[PDB]
């Protein structure tokens, strides 16, 4: 079925580097943003996403901490990865328990798959992925409630082209750090 076919394809890949092009389209049909950069990924939950143009930004997951680094304003935020990837198909990679796949209705047209959550209250209501029978990922998208779609076209996929340093982040000299992992709050 679509689910088994999609899992069988993604199962072929463990790590890669790829370059990406991003297109954000609003439901109006206007492409409201375009960008490019590099992605390194390593199972189960490690990634380094670096948007180089137009507005530089770095997301690094060591599998527990997600760092967001804006080099333009020299600000880095440390968050828990689990707080950013919840209610997405991230768990299909990071955990890959059979019942995780059962959260989504998955439909196939060739190398194109569409994942629709069955019982989510989240903002993301659709995912798409184009992945060849060899596990090469060509495209991915996510759709928000207002129909804003964030789409990624991957090129130059190279499996195994990652080192462990890509998945570690130490704030550079002079970078302001907001560590949201660590003043207690009074409530009515
Ligand atoms: C499909 C089958 C299973 C694959 C599942 C992958 C799920 C990816 C979700 C990533 C979580 C988002 C973290 C950003 C925080 C955020 O800002 N949240 C919300 C965002 S709301 C709007 C939108 C929504 O965000 C996105 O969907 C980003 C998509 C970009 C990734 C495209 C490459 C595809 C790679 C798939 C690889 C499979 C692995 C194969 C084997 C290794 O935001 C954006 O597009 C901008 C943010 C881009 C930053 C993405 C970098 C994460 C790449 C993670 C890929 C690693 C996958 C597993 C690791 C082994 C918010 N702002 O509230």
Numbering used by the authors: 1 to 182, 187 to 192
Excerpt from the publication:
With the exception of a subset of lipoproteins that carry a transport avoidance signature and remain in the inner membrane, the majority of lipoproteins are destined for the outer membrane. Their transport is directed by the Lol system that comprises the inner membrane transporter LolCDE, the periplasmic chaperone LolA, and the outer membrane receptor LolB, itself a lipoprotein. Following maturation on the inner membrane and extraction by the LolCDE transporter, lipoproteins are passed to the chaperone LolA that carries them across the periplasm prior to insertion into the outer membrane by the LolB receptor. LolA and LolB share structural homology, both being incomplete β-barrels with a central hydrophobic cavity closed by an alpha helical lid, but perform distinct functions. Here, we present the crystal structure of LolA in complex with a lipoprotein, providing a molecular description of the interaction and a rationale for the capacity of the chaperone protein to transport evolutionarily divergent lipoproteins.
Thus, to capture a LolA–lipoprotein intermediate favorable for structural studies, we introduced a tobacco etch virus (TEV) protease cleavage site in the N-terminal region of Pal to permit targeted removal of the lipoprotein linker and globular domain. We determined the crystal structure of LolA–Pal13 at 1.83-Å resolution. The protein complex crystallized in space group I4 with one molecule per asymmetric unit. We resolved density for the triacylated cysteine but not for the rest of the peptide chain, suggesting that LolA does not make specific interactions with the lipoprotein amino acid chain, consistent with our demonstration that transfer to LolB can occur in the absence of the lipoprotein globular domain. The three acyl chains of the ligand are inserted deeply in the U-shaped cavity of LolA with electron density compatible with 16-carbon chains, consistent with the predominant species in E. coli lipoproteins. The acyl chains pack together with R1 and R2 running straight down and R3 packed against the other two chains at ∼45° angle. The lipoprotein triacyl group is stabilized by van der Waals (VDW) interactions with multiple residues forming the hydrophobic cavity of LolA. Interestingly, two polar interactions between the carbonyl group of the R2 ester linkage and the side chains of both S150 and Y152 also stabilize the lipoprotein. Here, we show that the triacyl moiety opens the deepest part of the LolA pocket by a further 1.5-fold, increasing the cavity volume to ∼1,400 Å3. Relative to apo LolA, the helix is displaced by about 9 Å, a motion required for the accommodation of the three acyl chains deep inside the cavity.
